């Protein structure tokens, strides 16, 4: 219940672009696919995701789609640091 | 019109076809007009003395 | 040493003016021009300090003609007394002399030019 | 490079909503710091060596290159390359010991792990005495 | 309520921040296509 | 007439003045946003080589931007020398110098006061300001615990405006611990800044000992326990013999082969001279050839080559030993000792990490970040912090920050404004309004009302108390001693003295002469 | 400033420089409110409305009618 | 003294000097056309 919470809602909404981009590259409808991401995740706490071979949603651990945690950690961490530096810019002055 | 266009930019990123976007605003625009036509009140029942005041309400708004 | 700041200029201006009407000749206008030329320095100090050049120049000419003491000049810092014994100002004689010598010796050369040819670069 | 642009798109509409940029910046740092703690609970530990997980992870992580369909034999090649260097302290394994020699010719299917140290340069062939050596003693000359 | 405690002058930082965001997102749109298994390669 | 010639801009007494003041306004409005904790950083785009530079320091902003205005060049130079003296507070000089001229523009136009009369008010006003600044200070260094705490507060106050404002609670320990390790030696060359890509801003950790970006030889081992360290400014390269002018006359090549044998025997005997001490590592300034490198293998000696000139003193002070080149007498030149000589990797580059040395008179600040623009800001930020804290060791007096130093100085100026007769008393009050304009700008950058907090702060300090200040987080008046905001005495003394001289130079102008450019 | 001076020259025929210097000084005085004090532009004009109303009211009482005598009107 | 009025303006006296020299330039052009010893000017 704060203005910081309203920013976190946009933080959660903008983070969903990765499965949306996978839907467009695979040709599937993003809303139909992302609707299944919401329908299966309240019960499935992990290993639920998209598989490109079958073109649908399934258990990724059975299909063997795994990645390190440091990759996703560095992505969220470095992305927040880059936005921290860009938003502090106010003027674009030419120099030597 | 820019507000509809700015919100349409986010929906184009999701991959919605533009005709479904355009049909959505057409159904939403008529639905909003149908609701606002019911909630607004009529002023013709009042006499001419109060009807002059309603013009003064809108005249001060426009100036 | 000497005491400048308009005191030496007005002292040297009236010295040549008192000798101008004694030695009328034809060069009396040159003595008067030399007198008025020396007065531009204390008038410049009076102009920069904001004081009236009329009251400043008239006071120095009237006072220095009356009294023989020749260390009163233009007070630029706005003190109440114009006597420079108390204001701690001293100048050298060789420095104030060269202002008149290098000026009067240059202007002889400036006046003797008639033909002026300037080759454009 | 995509999540950064997405968060900038989130910050685009938030600038119009009368919120300061510093408040928007600190919100992502606090939100990102909480995001690390969530994944630390979700991630599962593995053994020092496991061919079932490492080979499948290496194959499904490339996923976009030309050699992704050739990953049936190159994913074991990547696992066997790193497993030779092992340590309990979880050191940052240097890739200088794993040299990738580029030779123009052939096909990618012929790529295979060489047992010994492969040399990129060719022979001089000024005299051309020997042709093929067997049971040779190798020496490294640094002088001239 | 209104006309008190401030007035936001120098709105050019707001215009500059918008220009930097759309400039960064426009570059990200070209990189967005290369994501995932169904992404594509780029020749430069 | 035209004496100056063609293409020569001249101005006289209404174009000369009001061109420097608008230049002082032009240079001041740029650095207005950078002042304070909530200030926005300015990005500089170079005209050539597409080189960008993110920087908050006002001196660096004026270094890169070209400015043909002569009045702006005065502000360019005073920020340069202010960065040379203290390193921090260059923006306050440019803002205070511009606002002093902004006020003096009105005194010349509105009140119609001579420029020399304005300076005479500033001389008495500056003297009253520095006397109040001297009396408002407080002693320190009698208790090491209080001296430790004040350096932590100075580091927090300095890094509050830079990019480290969020992590200043952690970087304050990193900044103050390195300064106490210097053992009084005031010098910034003994601190290294290693650039590492990756991680986040708070991942910067304090290093025990000394770390640098070098490498072992080809055949050397990874770990040696209790290694003796030596530093040679020597030439283990092809030494030649120094009587340049030696040549070799050869009648037959039989003795020439024995001559080359003597050259190898000459350097063998030199490496044999190294082994008399029984060292475990050998550090050389310049490149080591392979033949010396092979001789350190069997003797059990490590090798490090191509050390910078600064790296020699930076490593020697941590080792405790002295640089040796002759190697003749083993009696003198007692060397140090290091426990762990094992290298580590931070990113894609290995670094030689040392630990357990005799002394730590030189240090190294390891930094982690995303973009090199942020690391460049991290370098300039801590360079200003370490520069202020290093000069705080030699100059002990400090003064409260948070805008209270500006208002407490103006209190004595306003007190001395009444007893001064003439028109210069208005200029004495103009100096007071210039000091008041700094906390007015601190409230503008934070987005809060400036007139209320300045009015509340001004009315509060005249009541009798002198510890109040601005709290921009809450947006109200608070106690600065509770928050722990304090700055050095020489910083604000240099700012007020430099700003007084800045207005004095530009106010004594009447004409501008701009010769033709080359 | 050119057009307000043209209307004043055509309307009355005097006081054009007073309008030019006063209207510029009102914007000069309004500059520091925008920069230093950070006042809204709608607040500056709103004060000038009430300030101008009281200004013309001062001239209502400060005036004097000399119509009753032609000799005083001649003077 | 310090309380004297500087007046803030040297441009007016400079413009008057430029006008006097410009007015004396043409006045000295026709100085030699006065009296019985004057000379004619063909334009
Ligand atoms: N405090 C003072 N009181 C009275 N006269 C002064 C004072 N200071 C300077 N002057 C006078 O003004 C003159 C200024 O000379 P100065 O400008 O210093 O030399 P220059 O003209 O070569 O630069 C001096 O010759 C001196 O007589
Ligand atoms: N945490 C803080 N709270 C309140 N005021 C601060 C704080 N940190 C800095 N300031 C104020 O900011 C002013 C300028 O800070 P400084 O570090 O000199 O910035 P810069 O280096 O950009 O000039 C100081 O006068 C100080 O009073
Ligand atoms: N002799 C005088 N004594 C006092 N005030 C005067 C005198 N002469 C003029 N003024 C003042 O100077 C002002 C001149 O205004 P004016 O130049 O006529 O304005 P404008 O040229 O714009 O019509 C008048 O308001 C008048 O009060
Ligand atoms: Mg990958
Ligand atoms: Mg600072
Ligand atoms: Mg008139």
Would you kindly provide a written description of the structure presented here, covering whatever features stand out?
It is classed as chaperone. Keywords: TRiC/CCT, phosducin-like protein, chaperone. Yeast TRiC-plp2 complex at S5 closed TRiC state. This is part of a larger assembly, with four copies of chain A, two copies of chain B and two copies of chain F. Chain A has a two-stranded antiparallel ribbon. By secondary structure, chain A is an alpha+beta fold. Chain A has helices at residues 3-14, 17-26, 30-41, 60-63, 69-87; strands spanning 48-51, 56-59, 89-95. In chain A, strand 1 and strand 2 form a beta hairpin. Chain B is mainly α. Chain B contains three helices and no strands. The two termini of chain B are 24 Å apart. Chain F has 518 residues and is an alpha+beta fold. In chain F, helix 3 (70-85) runs antiparallel to helix 16 (489-507) and helix 6 crosses helix 7 (168-180). Chain F has helices at residues 20-30, 58-64, 70-85, 90-111, 115-135, 144-158, 168-180, 253-275, 290-298, 309-319, 372-394, 404-415, 424-445, 450-462, 480-483, 489-507, and strands spanning 9-12, 41-46, 52-55, 191-194, 211-212, 225-227, 231-232, 281-284, 302-304, 338-340, 344-345, 350-353, 363-366, 398-400, 468-471, 476-479, 486-488, 511-514. The two termini of chain F are 24 Å apart. Chain F has a domain at 210-366: GroEL (3-Layer(bba) Sandwich), CATH 3.50.7.10. Classes of the chains: A alpha+beta (96), B mainly alpha (63), F alpha+beta (518). Chains A and D meet through helix 1, helix 2 and helix 5 of A and helix 1, helix 2 and helix 3 of D. Strand 3 of chain A pairs parallel with strand 2 (41-46) of chain F, so a sheet runs across the interface. The complex binds adenosine-5'-diphosphate (3 copies) and magnesium ion (3 copies). Residues 34-37, 88-89, 91-92, 157-158, 160-161, 401-403, 442, 470, 472, 485 of chain F line the site of one adenosine-5'-diphosphate (ADP).
Strand fraction of chain A: 15-25%
Task: Give the strand content of chain B.
Answer: under 5%
Oligomerization category of the chains in this entry: part of a larger assembly
For the largest sheet of chain A, list the strands in their spatial order: 1-2
- Rg of chain A, Cα atoms, Å: 18 Å
Record field, number of beta strands of chain A: 3
End-to-end CA span of chain B: 24 Å
- Alpha-beta classification of chain A: alpha+beta
Number of helical regions of chain A = 5
Global geometry of chain B: elongated
Q: Provide the succession of SSEs of chain B.
A: HHH
């Amino acid at each position: 219940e704060g203005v910081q919470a309203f920013i976190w809602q946009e933080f959660a909404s903008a983070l969903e672009v990765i499965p949306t981009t996978l839907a467009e590259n695979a040709g599937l409808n993003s809303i139909k696919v992302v609707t299944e991401l919401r329908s299966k995740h309240e019960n499935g706490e992990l290993n639920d995701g998209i598989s490109v071979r079958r073109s649908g949603t399934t258990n990724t651990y059975e299909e063997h789609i795994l990645q390190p945690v440091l990759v996703s950690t560095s992505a969220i961490t470095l992305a927040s640091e880059c936005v921290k530096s860009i938003l502090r810019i106010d003027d674009i002055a030419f120099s030597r | 019109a820019s507000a509809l266009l700015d919100q349409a930019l986010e929906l184009i990123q999701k991959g919605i076809h533009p005709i479904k976007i355009a049909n959505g605003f057409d159904e939403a625009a008529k639905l909003a007009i149908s609701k606002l036509e019911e909630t607004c009140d009529d002023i013709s029942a009042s006499n001419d003395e109060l009807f002059r005041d309603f013009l003064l309400r809108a005249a001060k708004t426009s100036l | 040493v000497v005491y400048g700041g308009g005191a030496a200029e007005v002292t040297m201006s009236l010295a040549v003016s008192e000798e101008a009407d004694k030695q009328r000749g034809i060069d009396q206008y040159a003595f008067r021009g030399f007198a008025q030329a020396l007065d531009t320095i204390p008038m410049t100090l009076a102009e920069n300090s904001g004081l009236d050049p009329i009251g400043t120049l008239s006071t120095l000419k009237s006072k220095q003609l009356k009294e023989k003491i020749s260390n009163i000049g233009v007070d630029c810092l706005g003190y109440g007394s114009n006597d420079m014994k108390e204001l701690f100002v001293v100048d050298p004689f060789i420095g104030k002399k060269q202002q008149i010598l290098l000026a009067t010796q240059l202007c002889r050369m400036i006046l003797k030019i008639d033909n002026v040819i300037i080759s454009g670069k | 490079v995509i999540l950064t642009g997405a968060l900038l798109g989130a910050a685009e509409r938030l600038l119009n909503k009368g919120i300061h940029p510093t408040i928007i910046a600190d919100s992502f740092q606090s939100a990102a710091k909480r995001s690390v703690d969530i994944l630390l609970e979700m991630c599962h530990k593995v053994s020092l060596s496991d061919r079932e997980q490492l080979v499948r992870a290496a194959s499904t992580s490339l996923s976009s290159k030309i050699v992704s369909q050739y990953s049936s034999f190159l994913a074991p090649l990547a696992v066997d390359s790193v497993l030779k260097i092992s340590d309990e302290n979880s050191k940052n394994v240097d890739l200088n010991d794993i040299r990738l020699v580029k030779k123009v010719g052939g096909t990618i299917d012929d790529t295979e792990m060489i047992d010994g140290v492969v040399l990129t340069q060719t022979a001089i062939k000024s005299a051309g005495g020997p042709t093929r050596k067997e049971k040779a003693k190798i020496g490294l000359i640094q002088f001239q | 309520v209104p006309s008190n405690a401030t007035f936001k002058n120098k709105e050019k930082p707001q215009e500059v921040r918008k220009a930097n965001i759309i400039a960064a997102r426009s570059v990200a749109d070209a990189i967005r296509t290369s994501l995932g298994p169904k992404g594509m390669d780029k020749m430069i | 007439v035209q004496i100056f010639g063609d293409q020569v801009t001249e101005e006289r007494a209404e174009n000369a003045r009001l061109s420097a003041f608008v230049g002082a306004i032009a240079v001041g409005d740029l650095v207005k946003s950078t002042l304070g904790p909530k200030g926005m950083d300015k990005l500089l785009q170079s005209a050539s080589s597409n080189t960008c530079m993110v920087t908050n320091d006002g001196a660096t902003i004026l270094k890169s931007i070209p400015l043909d205005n002569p009045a702006a060049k005065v502000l360019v130079n005073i920020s340069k020398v202010q960065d040379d003296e203290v390193g921090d507070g260059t923006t306050s000089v440019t803002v205070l110098s511009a606002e002093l001229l902004r006020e003096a523009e009105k005194l010349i136009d509105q009140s119609k006061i001579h420029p020399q009369t304005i300076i005479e008010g500033y001389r008495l006003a500056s003297a009253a300001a520095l006397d109040a600044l001297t009396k408002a200070a407080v002693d320190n260094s009698h208790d090491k615990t209080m001296f430790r705490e004040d350096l932590i507060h100075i580091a927090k106050t300095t890094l509050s405006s830079k990019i480290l404002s969020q992590d200043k609670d952690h970087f304050a320990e990193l900044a103050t611990n390195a300064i106490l390790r210097l053992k009084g030696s005031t010098n910034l060359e003994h601190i290294q800044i290693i650039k590492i890509l990756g991680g986040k801003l708070s991942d910067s950790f304090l290093d025990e000992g000394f770390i640098l970006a070098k490498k072992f030889g080809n055949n050397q081992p990874k770990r040696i326990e209790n290694a003796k360290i030596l530093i040679a400014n020597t030439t283990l390269d092809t030494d030649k013999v120094k009587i340049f002018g030696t040549k070799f006359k050869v009648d037959s090549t039989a003795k020439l082969a024995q001559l080359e044998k003597a050259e190898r025997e000459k350097m063998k005997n030199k490496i044999a001279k190294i082994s008399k001490f029984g060292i475990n590592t050998f550090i050389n300034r310049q490149l080591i050839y392979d033949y010396p490198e092979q001789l350190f293998t069997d003797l059990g000696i490590n090798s490090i080559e191509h050390a910078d000139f600064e790296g020699v003193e930076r490593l020697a002070l941590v080792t405790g030993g002295e640089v040796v080149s002759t190697f003749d007498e083993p009696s003198k030149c007692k060397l140090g000792e290091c426990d762990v000589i094992e290298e580590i990797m931070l990113g894609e580059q290995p670094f030689l990490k040392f630990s357990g040395c005799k002394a730590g008179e030189a240090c190294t600040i390891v930094l982690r970040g995303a973009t090199d623009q942020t690391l460049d800001e991290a370098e300039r930020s801590l360079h200003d912090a370490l520069s202020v804290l290093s000069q705080t060791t030699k100059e002990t007096r400090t003064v409260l920050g948070g805008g209270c130093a500006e208002m407490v100085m103006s209190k004595a100026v306003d007190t001395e404004a009444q007893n001064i007769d003439g028109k210069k008393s208005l200029a004495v009050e103009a100096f007071a309004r210039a000091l008041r304009q700094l906390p007015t700008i601190l409230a503008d950058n934070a987005g809060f009302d400036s007139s209320e907090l300045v009015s509340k702060l001004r009315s509060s300090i005249y009541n009798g108390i002198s510890t109040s200040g601005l709290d921009l987080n809450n947006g109200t008046i608070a106690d600065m001693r509770q928050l722990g905001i304090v700055e050095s005495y020489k910083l604000k003394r240099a700012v007020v003295s430099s700003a007084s001289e800045a207005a004095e130079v530009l106010l004594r102008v009447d004409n501008i002469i701009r010769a033709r450019p080359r």
